[PDB]
Amino acid sequence: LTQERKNEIIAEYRVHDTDTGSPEVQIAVLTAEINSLNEHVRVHKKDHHSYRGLMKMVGHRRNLLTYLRKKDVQRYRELIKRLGLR
């Protein structure tokens, strides 16, 4: 994932004018990265270290989503409906 592409991800789901640490932007970036690695793994079957990286980021995103849900429900519903999860 190139830096500029991540910059548009940050700019689209930003909460305020200088937000980079909110769970929304982190979840969006993680979703983009895991989609890219899903494509790569679908290409290369037996690259297992990258698959471990996939699993690591999937777990991290799951914990982030659980924290966001336990903090706020409306924001969680908005994220899941905007990014198409579950």
Partner RNA sequence: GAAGACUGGAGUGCAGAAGAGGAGAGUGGAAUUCCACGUGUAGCGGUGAAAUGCGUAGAUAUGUGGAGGAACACCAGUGGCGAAGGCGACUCUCUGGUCUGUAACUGACGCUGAGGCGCGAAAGCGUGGGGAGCAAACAGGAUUAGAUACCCUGGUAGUCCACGCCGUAAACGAUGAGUGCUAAGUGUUAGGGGGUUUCCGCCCCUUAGUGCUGCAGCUAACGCAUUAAGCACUCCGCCUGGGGA
Partner RNA sequence: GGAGGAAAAAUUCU
Count of residues interacting with RNA (CB under 7 A): 37
Contact status, residue 53 vs residue 30, Cβ threshold 8 Å? no
With the CA atoms of 49, 51, 54 and 60 taken in that order, what torsion angle do they form, in degrees rounded to the nearest 10?
-70
Contact letters for RNA, residues 16-55 (x by CB under 7 A) = x-xxxxxx-xx--x---x--xx--x--xxxxxxxxxxx--
Binding region for RNA (CB under 7 A) = 1, 3, 6-7, 10, 15-16, 18-23, 25-26, 29, 33, 36-37, 40, 43-53, 56-57, 63-64, 67, 71
